[PDB]
Amino acid sequence: VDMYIERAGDITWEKDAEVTGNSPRLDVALDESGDFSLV
Amino acid sequence: ETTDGVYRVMTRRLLGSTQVGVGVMQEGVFHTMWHVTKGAALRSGEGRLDPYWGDVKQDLVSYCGPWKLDAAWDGLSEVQLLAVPPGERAKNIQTLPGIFKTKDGDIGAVALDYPAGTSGSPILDKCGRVIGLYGNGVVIKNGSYVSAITQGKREEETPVE
Ligand SMILES: N=C(N)N[C@@H]1CCCCNC(=O)[C@H](CCCCN)NC(=O)[C@H](CCCCN)NC(=O)Cc2cccc(c2)CNC(=O)CCNC1=O
Numbered sequence: 001v002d003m004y005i006e007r008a009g010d011i012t013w014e015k016d017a018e019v020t021g022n023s024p025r026l027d028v029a030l031d032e033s034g035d036f037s038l039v
Numbered sequence: 040e041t042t043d044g045v046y047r048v049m050t051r052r053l054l055g056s057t058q059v060g061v062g063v064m065q066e067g068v069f070h071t072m073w074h075v076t077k078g079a080a081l082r083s084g085e086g087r088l089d090p091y092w093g094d095v096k097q098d099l100v101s102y103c104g105p106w107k108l109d110a111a112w113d114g115l116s117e118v119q120l121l122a123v124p125p126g127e128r129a130k131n132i133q134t135l136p137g138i139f140k141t142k143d144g145d146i147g148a149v150a151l152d153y154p155a156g157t158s159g160s161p162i163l164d165k166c167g168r169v170i171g172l173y174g175n176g177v178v179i180k181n182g183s184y185v186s187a188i189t190q191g192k193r194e195e196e197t198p199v200e
Contacts, residue, residue: 005082
């Protein structure tokens with residue numbers, strides 16, 4: 001029942017950050033309920 | 040409180056608390072993903088935050104005022120996810136976005152996979168501006184995850200009578 005927020009930090013870009021992840025290009029549909037699905 | 044920054048969104052039942060998501064306080068407005076709060080009210084310290092604007096299709100909700108975050112991915116540049124995972128320190132991870140191609144246009148998308156309660160974590164450009172929130176995405180064939188860079192519209196001020 002009790003949903004609450006607690007601060008977790010400042011928002012900053014980190015200068016020497018770890019880099020990861022590829023850059024996929026995906027065909028997707030977005031429905032009226034906010035669901036993305038692959039086409 | 041409404042001091043700027045990134046916040047965890049927690050739920051408490053009978054035993055202890057669970058982190059269900061993350062959101063961004065900016066200009067006195069709290070920004071998070073709809074699936075984190077289901078559009079319900081939030082407590083901040085002793086104060087209540089009431090939903091103000093939201094859109095389940097964008098999977099976004101703002102509290103106390105209209106959506107304030109208006110920076111967009113430029114397309115070409117790397118971005119950072121300022122991930123705030125349950126039970127862990129906030130950490131930045133840098134990545135070059137891919138693309139969700141939709142019938143209505145392209146959406147930047149990050150191939151970064153974090154616990155569900157990381158939903159709402161901000162994605163940043165190199166100026167530290169929030170260009171979207173993490174956590175509305177798809178699972179591709181090998182089970183890994185790709186999140187849209189989900190950003191709301193900062194509307195012009197509403198007229199006054
Ligand atoms: N699956 C991952 N590799 N990572 C995801 C990352 C989640 C990041 C934060 N975002 C969300 O929680 C949102 C909420 C719904 C928004 C809806 N508007 N969820 C999604 O965007 C996709 C939507 C898929 C397409 C819908 N057509 N749902 C999942 O991924 C659920 C899923 C699927 C298979 C297996 C699992 C969990 C089991 N893993 C775990 O429990 C470990 C945790 N990691 C995960 O949950």
